[PDB]
Every structure is written in C-alpha cells, then in structure tokens.
Amino acid sequence: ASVMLNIMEEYDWYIFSIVTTYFPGYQDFENKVRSTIENSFVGWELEEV
Amino acid sequence: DHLTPTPISYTAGFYRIPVIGLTTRMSIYSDKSIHLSFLRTVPPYSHQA
C-alpha cells in the first residue's frame, strides 16, 4: 500500500479512490492508507472506498 | 478451550458450502469476510448488547 502511495506521489496523482473486496486484509488496507495518507501535509483526496 | 467449530467454516468455505452452527454463540463468526459461509441460529454475545 505504501508503494502504491509512493507510485501515486511520484506521478503526483493526488486524487484517488479504493475499490476493495471482502478478501482478507481489506479493512486494514484502509487503515494503513488512512495513516499514510493522513500524516502527510498534502491535501490529497480519498473519494470512495 | 473455545470456538471448536472454527475449522469447518473455513473448510466448507473454500467450496462455499453453507455451514450452520447450533451451539456456537461465538461472535468472531459474524464477520462475513473471514467466515463467509457461516449460518447462525442465534445472535452473538455482541448482539446481546
């Protein structure tokens, strides 16, 4: 998830959404992203989960 | 110990064979994500609230 964020940051794609399924680790994925996205000063947008 | 009927929910679950517990009031089976074939006769301790 971190690498996905780094990739997005590299291309400076600030605005994104997450499509997930009930498959394992889905809830945390959101949590890990919530921390990683949240900590940064930048105003990127999570649109939908 | 507790939650003796953990394996079956997984085992049937691979083939999506529905499982119905009689005596498992355990709450951990309520999440569809981990046990997706689980069928419960009665509500968990959480629902007791």
B23: CB partners within 8 A, 6+ apart: B5
Distance CA B41, CA A30 (A): 32
Distance CA B37, CA A5 (A): 34
Distances from the Cα of B32 to the Cα of A15, B39, B40, angstroms: 30, 10, 12
> Is A24 part of the contact surface with chain B (CB cutoff 8 Å)?
yes
Phi, psi of B21 (to 5 degrees): -90, 140
Show the beta-strand stretches assigned E in A1-49: 15-16, 45-46
Q: Which helix (H) or strand (E) holds A37?
A: helix A26-39
Question: Structure solved using which method?
Answer: cryo-EM
| Residue from A23, B26, A26 nearest B38 by CA | B26
A27 touches chain B (CB under 8 A): yes
One-letter identity of residue A24: P
Q: What is the C-alpha to C-alpha distance for residues A5 and A42, in angstroms, rounded to an integer?
A: 13
In angstroms, what separates the C-alpha of A25 from chain B's closest C-alpha?
9
Q: Give the distance from residue B26's alpha carbon to the nearest chain A alpha carbon, in angstroms.
A: 20
Residue B10 contacts A where some CB pair is shorter than 8 Å = no
Residue A40: count of CB within 10 angstroms of its CB: 10
CA atoms within 13 A on the CB side of A21: 2
